[PDB]
Design an enzyme around this catalytic site. Structure first.
Site, PDB file in Angstrom:
ATOM      1  N   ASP A   1      -2.239  -1.284   5.917  1.00  0.00           N
ATOM      2  CA  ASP A   1      -2.509  -0.753   7.248  1.00  0.00           C
ATOM      3  C   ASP A   1      -3.791   0.083   7.229  1.00  0.00           C
ATOM      4  O   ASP A   1      -3.857   1.188   7.758  1.00  0.00           O
ATOM      5  CB  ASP A   1      -1.319   0.066   7.747  1.00  0.00           C
ATOM      6  CG  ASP A   1      -1.045   1.285   6.885  1.00  0.00           C
ATOM      7  OD1 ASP A   1      -1.751   1.478   5.873  1.00  0.00           O
ATOM      8  OD2 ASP A   1      -0.120   2.053   7.222  1.00  0.00           O
TER       9      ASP A   1
ATOM     10  N   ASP B   1      -7.728  -2.272   3.146  1.00  0.00           N
ATOM     11  CA  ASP B   1      -6.778  -3.360   2.949  1.00  0.00           C
ATOM     12  C   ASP B   1      -7.117  -4.602   3.763  1.00  0.00           C
ATOM     13  O   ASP B   1      -6.525  -5.658   3.518  1.00  0.00           O
ATOM     14  CB  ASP B   1      -5.366  -2.892   3.308  1.00  0.00           C
ATOM     15  CG  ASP B   1      -4.934  -1.677   2.512  1.00  0.00           C
ATOM     16  OD1 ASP B   1      -5.253  -1.610   1.307  1.00  0.00           O
ATOM     17  OD2 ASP B   1      -4.276  -0.788   3.093  1.00  0.00           O
TER      18      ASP B   1
ATOM     19  N   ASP C   1       0.836  -1.188   0.000  1.00  0.00           N
ATOM     20  CA  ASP C   1       0.000   0.000   0.000  1.00  0.00           C
ATOM     21  C   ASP C   1       0.878   1.249   0.000  1.00  0.00           C
ATOM     22  O   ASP C   1       2.040   1.222   0.415  1.00  0.00           O
ATOM     23  CB  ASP C   1      -0.929   0.004   1.214  1.00  0.00           C
ATOM     24  CG  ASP C   1      -2.075   0.983   1.068  1.00  0.00           C
ATOM     25  OD1 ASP C   1      -1.823   2.205   1.098  1.00  0.00           O
ATOM     26  OD2 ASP C   1      -3.230   0.530   0.925  1.00  0.00           O
TER      27      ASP C   1
HETATM   28  F1  ALF Z   1      -3.617   3.974  -0.161  1.00  0.00           F
HETATM   29 AL1  ALF Z   1      -4.281   2.796   1.004  1.00  0.00          AL
HETATM   30  F2  ALF Z   1      -4.945   1.618   2.169  1.00  0.00           F
HETATM   31  F3  ALF Z   1      -3.240   3.473   2.284  1.00  0.00           F
HETATM   32  F4  ALF Z   1      -5.322   2.117  -0.277  1.00  0.00           F
HETATM   33 MG   LIG Z   2      -2.698   2.961   4.219  1.00  0.00          MG
END
Ligand code: ALF
Ligand SMILES: [Mg+2]
Length: 728
Positions: free
Chosen positions: A588, A592, A379
């Site tokens: 995180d 996700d 991520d």
């Molecule tokens: F950009 Al993210 F979970 F931090 F999709």
């Molecule tokens: Mg994130």
């Protein structure tokens, strides 16, 4: 899962209770016992009767769950450890009872040799091993409860309309709310249901789907997502989706489907036993038949190597009985007890090492699974780059010091609640002595437009008159023109994905400040090391394609997926897994969490959301990206040790099989009563100590990783990286 642990512990405790006397009695017999050899009846001796009673109790109580599990395995057409133990122990006990009964019937002078000690030891050690395995496997999964906690318990239902007729404001449980109703969301309150904003303007935080912390302007006609955090005012929402139809409910459904998709993994002990059981049966039958043949053909070998010929029984009876005894002795010797302790102990030890190294590993599956990873998904926000926005560059657009302007802006932006404003203020404070902010300041803000302030306390800044902060539109409406050079610099900043704002004093442009997320120091090195090891790196994020591309260029990731929704992450993980690759998801965030659950190994940053921590199997308490590499290495070592443990579980017992079968009898070596116990002491210990050796592991230094990549590492070019928006 609790029942398995409870019943295995009960079986182990009963085996201990009714077998420790057995083992101590056999040890005492081996050490020297005339009274013990005394016979109540010619067939049976005191020691034999005690062993019979103890072994009967152990098998009736300790072996009950063993028998049930073996029968269940047979239902599945699979031979496992339970089947091996049950079969061997039952055969030994039946043979011992039969020989005791026939000796009593024949009133023989000397009681026959019995194998009543074998079942207790096998049951004790196998139960201990399986109990440890089930302790290791047990884990807590509270991701679903955490997701439910996000949803608002209650909502404010409105009556009539929002234009000129309104009667009452009432409180209703979220479940009872239905489509077509109008509800009220107060600032700082959770959004109850999916809907459209009517007669209200505010700012909503929507980290559940997109994952970023940047506030989102919500205006009449816009759509709200349930679970988003409202602020900046009061809003009215007309429901469009309620209950299961909400996006949060869809995320919950995806998480539960991913969790249910995971299937039990067959332990290497069961796989080994599957081959072992046919092998042990084959060797036992071969020994029986060959001994019968030897006895029949000549019968001299039987007399020479055995005293049973002294018995008055017929010679055929002698040969048959000795063949049966030798075959069952081979059967008893072959069985490994330390096998159950092969995988579990090491796993636990490895987990401890991870705990000492700042990596929290839940269960033994992640350690057995990480080494097989061939692709890692990262991520962007929080994982690869710090979530907090930070100032990158400040430029000066009559010629007054930059630090003074920064202090003046900080005083002007002191009360700003926008993340960019507070980031600018903290950067100014860091640059300056920041003993205390200016006492005198007048503040005015037009949201999404800009801020105008009056500061007359420049004397305080000097000790350590108008300020205006705005974007393009602010200058255009106020009449201030934009220079070509400043315009080009601002456009370059926008291209990189870093937001730029301009400061003017007394109606004159003075400076420009850029703010953006900063990539973690270890991100580039971790990505390079992962690529060098052969693991593909994919940057998947819901943030705008420009910033994702810039971050990928900074961290050298070739594949970029931007504007990815939570379901698209799961789809990508599923596709990569279907490619026969093993995927590790590093996330995180709530979005996700379904990907972490579906991913073979879910690594969650320590500072991530609670649901992300619960869903993930591995947690980085030290929130260091390089640990992802280390987590792999440890797993490798662990599995290697596990394999070695299995050797220690088998080798010794295997060495006994040739001896038990009489291979070395001509040399003069015959199986002795102590050997059966001795191997078990040698094997089990040889396993446990080996596992303990895993505690010697130490993390390789990041300097080592950099040195291995000292010259190989090279920055990428923006054109080379590819960007994909959404699944489609
Ligand atoms: F950009 Al993210 F979970 F931090 F999709
Ligand atoms: Mg994130």
């Amino acid at each position: 899962h609790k029942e398995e642990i409870k019943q295995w512990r009960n079986s182990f405790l009963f085996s201990l209770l009714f077998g420790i006397p057995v083992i101590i009695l056999m040890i005492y017999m081996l050490a020297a016992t005339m009274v013990l050899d005394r016979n109540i009846v010619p067939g049976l001796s005191i020691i034999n009767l005690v062993f019979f009673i103890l072994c009967t109790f152990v098998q009736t109580l300790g072996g009950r769950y063993f028998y049930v599990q073996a029968y269940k395995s047979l239902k599945h057409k699979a031979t496992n450890m339970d089947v091996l133990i049950v079969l061997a122990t039952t055969i030994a006990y039946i043979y011992s009872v039969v020989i005791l009964t026939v000796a009593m019937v024949e009133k023989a002078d000397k009681s026959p040799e019995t194998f009543f000690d074998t079942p207790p030891m096998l049951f004790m050690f196998i139960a201990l091993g399986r109990w440890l395995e089930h302790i290791a496997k047990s884990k807590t999964s509270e991701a679903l409860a955490k997701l439910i906690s996000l949803q608002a318990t209650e909502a404010a239902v409105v009556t009539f309309g929002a234009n000129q007729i309104i009667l009452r404001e009432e409180q209703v449980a979220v479940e009872l709310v239905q489509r077509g109703d109008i509800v009220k969301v107060v600032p700082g309150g959770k959004f109850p249901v999916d809907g459209k904003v009517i007669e209200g303007t505010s700012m909503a935080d929507e980290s559940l789907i997109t994952g970023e912390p940047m506030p989102v302007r919500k205006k009449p006609g816009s759509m709200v997502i349930a679970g988003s955090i409202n602020a900046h005012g009061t809003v009215l929402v007309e429901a469009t989706h309620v209950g299961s139809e909400t996006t949060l409910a869809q995320i919950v459904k995806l998480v539960e489907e991913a969790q249910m998709s995971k299937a039990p993994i067959q332990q290497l002990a069961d796989k080994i036993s599957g081959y072992f059981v046919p092998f042990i049966i084959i060797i036992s039958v071969v020994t029986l038949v060959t001994w019968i043949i030897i006895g029949f053909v000549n019968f001299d070998i039987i007399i020479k190597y055995f005293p049973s010929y002294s018995k008055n029984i017929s010679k055929t009876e002698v040969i048959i009985r000795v063949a049966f005894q030798t075959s069952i002795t081979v059967l008893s010797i072959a069985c490994p007890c330390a096998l159950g302790l092969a995988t579990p102990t090491a796993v636990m030890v490895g987990t401890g090492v991870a705990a000492q190294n700042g990596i929290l590993i839940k269960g033994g599956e992640p350690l057995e699974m990480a080494h097989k990873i061939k692709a890692v998904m990262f991520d962007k926000t929080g994982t690869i780059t710090h979530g907090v926005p930070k100032v990158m560059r400040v430029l000066l657009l009559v010629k007054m010091p930059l630090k003074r302007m920064l202090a003046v802006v900080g005083t002007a932006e002191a009360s700003s609640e926008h993340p960019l404003g507070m980031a600018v203020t903290k950067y100014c404070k860091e640059e300056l002595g920041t003993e205390l902010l200016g006492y005198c300041t007048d503040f005015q803000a037009v949201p999404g437009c800009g801020i105008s302030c009056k500061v007359n306390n420049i004397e305080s800044v000097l000790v350590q008159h108008t300020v205006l902060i705005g974007n393009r539109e602010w200058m255009r409406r106020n009449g201030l023109h934009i220079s070509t050079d400043v315009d080009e610099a601002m456009s370059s900043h926008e291209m990189k994905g870093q937001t730029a704002v301009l400061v003017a004093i007394d109606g004159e442009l003075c400076g420009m400040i850029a703010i953006a997320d900063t990539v973690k120091q270890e991100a580039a090195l971790a990505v390079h090391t992962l690529k060098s090891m052969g693991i593909d790196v994919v940057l998947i994020t819901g943030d705008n394609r420009k910033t994702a591309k810039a971050i990928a260029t900074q961290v050298g990731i070739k594949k970029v997926f931007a504007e990815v929704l939570p379901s698209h992450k799961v789809a990508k993980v599923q596709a990569l897994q279907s490619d026969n690759k093993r995927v590790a998801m590093v996330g995180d965030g709530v979005n996700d969490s379904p990907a972490l659950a579906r991913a073979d190994v879910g690594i969650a940053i320590g500072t991530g959301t609670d649901v992300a921590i619960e869903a993930a199997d591995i947690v980085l308490i030290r929130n260091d990206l390089l640990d992802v590499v280390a987590s792999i290495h440890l797993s490798k070592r662990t599995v290697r040790r596990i394999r070695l443990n299995f050797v220690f579980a088998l080798i010794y017992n295997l060495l006994g099989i040739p001896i038990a079968a009489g291979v070395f009898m001509p040399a003069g070596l015959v199986l002795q009563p102590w050997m059966g116990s001795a191997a078990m002491a040698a094997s089990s210990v040889s396993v446990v100590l080996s596992s303990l050796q895993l505690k010697c592991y130490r993390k390789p230094d990041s300097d080592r990783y950099e040195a291995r990549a000292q010259g190989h590492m090279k920055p990428l070019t923006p054109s080379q990286i590819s960007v994909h928006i959404g699944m489609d």
